[PDB]
Design a protein around this ligand. Sequence first.
Ligand SMILES: *[C@@H]1O[C@H](CO)[C@@H](O[C@@H]2O[C@H](CO)[C@@H](O)[C@H](O)[C@H]2NC(C)=O)[C@H](O)[C@H]1NC(C)=O
Ligand SMILES: *[C@@H]1O[C@H](CO)[C@@H](O)[C@H](O)[C@H]1NC(C)=O
Ligand SMILES: *[C@@H]1O[C@H](CO)[C@@H](O)[C@H](O)[C@H]1NC(C)=O
Ligand SMILES: *[C@@H]1O[C@H](CO)[C@@H](O)[C@H](O)[C@H]1NC(C)=O
Ligand SMILES: *[C@@H]1O[C@H](CO)[C@@H](O)[C@H](O)[C@H]1NC(C)=O
Ligand SMILES: *[C@@H]1O[C@H](CO)[C@@H](O)[C@H](O)[C@H]1NC(C)=O
Ligand SMILES: *[C@@H]1O[C@H](CO)[C@@H](O)[C@H](O)[C@H]1NC(C)=O
Ligand SMILES: *[C@@H]1O[C@H](CO)[C@@H](O)[C@H](O)[C@H]1NC(C)=O
Ligand SMILES: *[C@@H]1O[C@H](CO)[C@@H](O)[C@H](O)[C@H]1NC(C)=O
Ligand SMILES: *[C@@H]1O[C@H](CO)[C@@H](O)[C@H](O)[C@H]1NC(C)=O
Ligand SMILES: *[C@@H]1O[C@H](CO)[C@@H](O)[C@H](O)[C@H]1NC(C)=O
Ligand SMILES: *[C@@H]1O[C@H](CO)[C@@H](O)[C@H](O)[C@H]1NC(C)=O
Ligand SMILES: *[C@@H]1O[C@H](CO)[C@@H](O)[C@H](O)[C@H]1NC(C)=O
Lengths: 197, 189, 99, 366
Amino acid sequence: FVVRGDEVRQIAPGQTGKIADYNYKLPDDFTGCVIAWNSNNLDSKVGGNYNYLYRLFRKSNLKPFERDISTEIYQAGSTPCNGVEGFNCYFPLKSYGFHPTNGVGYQPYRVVVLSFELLNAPATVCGPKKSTNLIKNKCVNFNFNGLTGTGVLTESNKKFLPFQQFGRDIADTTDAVRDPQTLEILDITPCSFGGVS
Amino acid sequence: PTNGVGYQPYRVVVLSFELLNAPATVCGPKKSTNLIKNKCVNFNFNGLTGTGVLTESNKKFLPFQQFGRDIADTTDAVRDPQTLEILDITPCSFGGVSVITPGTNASNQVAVLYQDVNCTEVPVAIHADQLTPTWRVYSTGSNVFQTRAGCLIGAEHVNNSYECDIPIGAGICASYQTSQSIIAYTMSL
Amino acid sequence: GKLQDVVNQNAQALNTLVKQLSSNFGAISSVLNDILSRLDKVEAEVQIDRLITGRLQSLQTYVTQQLIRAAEIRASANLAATKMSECVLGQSKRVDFCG
Amino acid sequence: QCVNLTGRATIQPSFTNSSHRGVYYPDTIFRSNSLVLSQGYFLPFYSNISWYYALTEKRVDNPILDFKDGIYFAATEKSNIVRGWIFGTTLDNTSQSLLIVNNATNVIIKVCNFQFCYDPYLSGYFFAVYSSYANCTFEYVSKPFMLDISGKSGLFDTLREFVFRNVDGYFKIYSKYSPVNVNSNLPSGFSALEPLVELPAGINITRFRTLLTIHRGDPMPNNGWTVFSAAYYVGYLAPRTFMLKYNENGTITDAVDCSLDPLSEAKCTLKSFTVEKGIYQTSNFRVQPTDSIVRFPNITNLCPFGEVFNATTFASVYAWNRKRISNCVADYSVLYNSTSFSTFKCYGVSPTKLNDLCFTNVYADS
Ligand SMILES: *[C@@H]1O[C@H](CO)[C@@H](O[C@@H]2O[C@H](CO)[C@@H](O)[C@H](O)[C@H]2NC(C)=O)[C@H](O)[C@H]1NC(C)=O
Ligand SMILES: *[C@@H]1O[C@H](CO)[C@@H](O)[C@H](O)[C@H]1NC(C)=O
Ligand SMILES: *[C@@H]1O[C@H](CO)[C@@H](O)[C@H](O)[C@H]1NC(C)=O
Ligand SMILES: *[C@@H]1O[C@H](CO)[C@@H](O)[C@H](O)[C@H]1NC(C)=O
Ligand SMILES: *[C@@H]1O[C@H](CO)[C@@H](O)[C@H](O)[C@H]1NC(C)=O
Ligand SMILES: *[C@@H]1O[C@H](CO)[C@@H](O)[C@H](O)[C@H]1NC(C)=O
Ligand SMILES: *[C@@H]1O[C@H](CO)[C@@H](O)[C@H](O)[C@H]1NC(C)=O
Ligand SMILES: *[C@@H]1O[C@H](CO)[C@@H](O)[C@H](O)[C@H]1NC(C)=O
Ligand SMILES: *[C@@H]1O[C@H](CO)[C@@H](O)[C@H](O)[C@H]1NC(C)=O
Ligand SMILES: *[C@@H]1O[C@H](CO)[C@@H](O)[C@H](O)[C@H]1NC(C)=O
Ligand SMILES: *[C@@H]1O[C@H](CO)[C@@H](O)[C@H](O)[C@H]1NC(C)=O
Ligand SMILES: *[C@@H]1O[C@H](CO)[C@@H](O)[C@H](O)[C@H]1NC(C)=O
Ligand SMILES: *[C@@H]1O[C@H](CO)[C@@H](O)[C@H](O)[C@H]1NC(C)=O
C-alpha cells in the first residue's frame, strides 16, 4: 500500500494512530518484515495525486489483517442524516494530497509487508544459498530447509508423511529430516557420546 | 520555510501520568456498562482490569481511595466510580476441591469433596450457575454427606464401619461397593 | 516447645509463601492486573515471564524445605514407633533408651 | 432474480447435544505422540447444538444465525442438499461478505460485495442467491467436492463436519467426512477435524447463513418445492482448555474437555487419560468468565486538545510550558483530522492500551 511518511512508523505491531486503527493493523504476534521506501516522483505528480485514499472515520478499531472496503456514511453526531453528507456526518474516505513540493512527512511512501510462516511443510521460497553435496556418517553442521543443526546423518526409514520435512521426538529435538533434493528420509544422531568413563 | 527537514521546526508535547490510588481525573473514551454482581466476570474499574466475582460489602474506604489491597498485594476490594459503592472482589477459582474415584477401568463415577465448606453454600462457593449441568448435578443432591473436612457429594453415607481403601479425611473413608456405587463411612480402627 | 515450633515451622512457611507474592522480581509491579492493564500482549509478556519465574522458584523453594522437614519428621516418627514397640509393648534393656 | 418463497412452515429449530464431537487442531505445529493441554475456542462436550432440517410440512431451513467465535456445522444428507455458506456482517452491498458455493464438480469461494436477496436459495436442475457483485478482491476456485442430485431415497449415508473460524484475518475451514446410517439424529462418538483450507478473507464475520438446494424441476408445473431428506447441526465455539492426544501420524485420536465433569478435570490435572483408585486434588478448570464489565467515572467533558495542540505560539525549549490536564476524557482520535504525529513514543504504558486507562495527574510539557 501507499501511506505518507509520517505514518510509516505506524506499520508495526502494537502501534496506534490512524493507519493502525482504521486502515491496516498488524497482529501482536507478527512474524514477518516491513519494508517502506520513499516514492516521490513516482507516486506523486504536479497538481496533486489525489488517487490514494485513507479511511478517516470508523465505528470501531480494526482487528488484525482485516480490510474495511465499505464506504457508508459515518455518523458523528446525533441524527442519522439519512446517509448524505453535511453536518455531523461525513464521508469516511479522504484523499491524500501528494505534491512534488511536499515535505517528507507529506511525501508518498510505499510499504510492503511480508508475512512468513515456517511450518512443517515443503519449502516454497528459499534464500539465495547454493546447495552443497550431502555426506553421511560424519559429524557435520547441516542446513536442511533452514534447520541449522549439528550431528551425524545416517540413512534410515521412518516413513514420513508426504507433506512432511522433519520429524521430532519426545524431547522436541530433530529426530529425522527429509532430504529436500532426493526426497530421502535421513536420520540425525547426536555427535557426542556422553556415557564414557 | 525553505530549510531542510532536519532544521525545520517541530512541536513537542510530553504527557506525564501517575496512576495512583486517587480518584480518576482523566479517562479514556471507553464507555461504561451495567454492573452485575455474584457472577464470574472480567471487570475494569478506573482502568484496573481484573477477573473475579463481585459482592456488596463494607470495608470502610477512605474518601480519597479507589481500591483496597490485601497482604498478597491483590485487589481485595474496589470502589464503584459511579455509584460510590465499595464492592468486594473474590477469586473465581476454588482450589480446594478433591475428586474421589475408583480406577478408570472400574466405573466412570466419582465423588466430589469440597473442603471446609458448609453444604448449603456450596453452589455460591462453586458458582454452580455458570457451570455445565454435569457439574450442577454434583453441587446439590440427595447424596450430600457432611464431614469434618468439608462435605462430600456423590457418595452415600452408611452407618457401618469397615477398613477403608480411599482415605478422605477426618476419620471418613470411601470405597466402591455394591448396583455398584461409591460409599463413605467412618473408618473402623 | 518440641512440638510447638513444628507448628510454628509450618504456619510460618505458608505465611512467607503468601508474602512473597508481593515481590516485583524485577518486573514493573507485583500485580498481574497492573501489568495486564497497562501493557499490551507483546510487552507484558516479558514482565509476566519474570513474575512466573519468580513465583515458580518460590514454590520450588517451599516444596524443598517441606521435603527436608518431612524427612526429619519421618525420622522422629520412626524413633517414636520404635519407642512404642520396644518400651510400651515390652521391656527394654537398652541404657537410657526409655527414661 | 430472486423469488421470496411462500407456504413455508415456520423455522422451528430442535435441539441436541455435541457428544464428543468437533475437536479440531488449534495450531499448525505437527506434534506427534504427545498429550498436550491446549487453550482455545473449542466446542464443549455435550453442548447444546441447534438443529434444522429440510423436509417436504414443506419446510426449508435457511435462517440467519450468529457467528460468534467460529461455528461447528455438521450436515447429514442423502443427495448433497447443503451446497454453500454465506458469511459476513450485514449481508448486503454496503459491506463485504463471503460466499462458499460448490456446483457439481468444484467449489467457488468469492469474498465480495454481494447484494443477497431475502430468503436466498440455490436452484437445482434435473443462481438465485445474489443479484450483483462488484468492487472486490479475493477469488478462490481450487478445491474439490462431491455433488450429485441423485438417489433421493433411503436413510442418510454421509456426514460432513466443518469447523469455521475467523482469526487474524484468516478464515480457517476444518473438515471431516464420515459415512453413518442414522434416523434423523447426530451420531455419537469422537470426531477429529483435519485442517482443510485457510482463506485470507480478512473480513468482519458476525452472522452467517447456510444454503440449501431446491428442486423445482420439469415435472412440477405448480413450482414444486420438493426438497429431500437433509439435516444440519450448528454449535458455537467457546474458550475452553482441551487435552489432546497426538499419535505417531499427528492425528488427534482422543480428547478431554476438562470442564465437563469432575472425572475429566481430575483426568486433566494428572496428565493422563486413565486415573487410578484414590483421591486427587484438582486445579481449576470448571468456571470461565463470560461477561466483561467496564465502569469509568461519569465525566463527559472532551479534553482541550485544540489548545495543547494547534496553538498560535508554543514556548521556547529553554522556558518550556507546564499545563495541568484535568477533568478530561483522553481520546486522541479527534487529532487525526488535522495533525499527523511524526514521533509518538510511550514509556510505562502501551499506546494501544491508552483508551482503557484512567490517570490522575496528567501534565503536558510543550
Ligand atoms: C463487525 O460487525 C459488527 C456487526 O454487529 C459490528 O457491530 C458491533 O457488533 C458488536 C457485537 O457484539 C456489538 O456489541 C456492537 O454494538 C456493534 N456496533 C458497534 C461497535 O457500533 C462491529 O462494529 C464490526 N467490527 C468489529 C471490529 O467487530
Ligand atoms: C534438482 O537437482 C538435483 C541435483 O542437483 C537433481 O537430482 C534433482 O532431480 C533436481 N530436481 C528436483 C525437483 O529436485
Ligand atoms: C453518572 O451516571 C450514572 C448512571 O449512568 C448516574 O447514576 C450518576 O448519578 C451519574 N453521575 C455521577 C456519578 O456523578
Ligand atoms: C452450617 O453447618 C452447621 C452444622 O455444623 C449448621 O448448624 C448450620 O445451620 C449451617 N449453616 C447454614 C445452613 O447456613
Ligand atoms: C444411620 O444413623 C443415623 C444417625 O442418627 C440415623 O439417623 C439413621 O436412621 C441411620 N440409618 C440406618 C440405621 O439405616
Ligand atoms: C420478497 O421478494 C419480493 C420480490 O418482489 C418483495 O416484493 C418482498 O417485499 C420480499 N419480502 C420481504 C419480506 O421483503
Ligand atoms: C445427548 O444426546 C443423546 C442422543 O442424542 C441422548 O441419549 C442423551 O441423553 C443426551 N444427553 C446427555 C448425554 O447428557
Ligand atoms: C438448548 O437451548 C434451548 C433454547 O430454548 C433450550 O430450550 C433447551 O433446553 C437447551 N437444551 C439443553 C439440553 O439444555
Ligand atoms: C460450475 O463449475 C464449473 C467447473 O466445473 C465452474 O467453472 C463454474 O464457475 C461453476 N458455476 C457455478 C454457477 O457454480
Ligand atoms: C467501485 O469501483 C468503481 C470503479 O471505478 C468506482 O467508480 C466506485 O466508486 C467504487 N465504489 C462503489 C461503492 O461503487
Ligand atoms: C498413519 O497413516 C498411514 C497412512 O495414512 C497409515 O497407513 C497408518 O496406519 C497410520 N498410523 C496409525 C497408527 O494409524
Ligand atoms: C487550528 O485552530 C484554528 C482556529 O484557532 C483553525 O482555524 C485551524 O484550522 C486549526 N488547524 C490547523 C492550523 O491545522
Ligand atoms: C477534517 O479536516 C478538514 C480539512 O479541511 C476539514 O475541512 C473538516 O471539517 C475536518 N472534519 C472534522 C473536523 O470533523
